[PDB]
Write a protein that binds this ligand. Sequence first.
Ligand SMILES: [Zn+2]
Ligand SMILES: [Zn+2]
Length: 228
Amino acid sequence: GTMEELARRVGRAIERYLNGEINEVELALAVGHIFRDYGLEELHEIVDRLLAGEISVLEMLFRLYEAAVKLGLDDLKFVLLKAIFKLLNEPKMVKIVEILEEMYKRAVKKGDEETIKLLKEMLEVLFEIAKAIANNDKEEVKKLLAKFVLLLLEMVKRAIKKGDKETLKLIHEILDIIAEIFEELGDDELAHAARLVSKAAELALKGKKEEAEKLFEIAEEELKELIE
Ligand SMILES: [Zn+2]
Ligand SMILES: [Zn+2]
């Protein structure tokens, strides 16, 4: 079939594995069969390694995401990222990925193609965040999240000059989750920058978009200082 149903089938298989309905060998066999049915041999060879016991579920998910990036499958990328951030116990990152998927789905049904690139770059940043979390590199996670907040700031700046309103609400929700994550990581300046960007977005959405700009410059300057 189409690449839309492949992502749904793979997501259902991984969800069954995570909920405990099936085991590792059953998951490997089912996902390999799904990949072979759609003609994707490169993903099938990766799943063969999990079937052979060489690698684990998380490493296989990472390799599958890297291969899907090269192949250009987007819904598969979102499914794989959600599965990765569910294997590592982080509900907040899963919520961020869910909101990002909603924005991508809204963007693909219209002519907006500039936001697709932004969502791709932020997917790259989130993948790097997951890789740093897997290595327990807590210093790199903060820098990657700062880059993610800068990308969200770029998106909100682009959206304000347009008529989009639900984009502002989704970005505000994402920024609030990011600020909560920063607070739980024992940081306050980056959390303050995230909340400043969120406040600017909310002020622009409310109707007062003149006070939003000074907040935007203040927040971006602070983020650039804290990235170094
Ligand atoms: Zn095989
Ligand atoms: Zn404070």
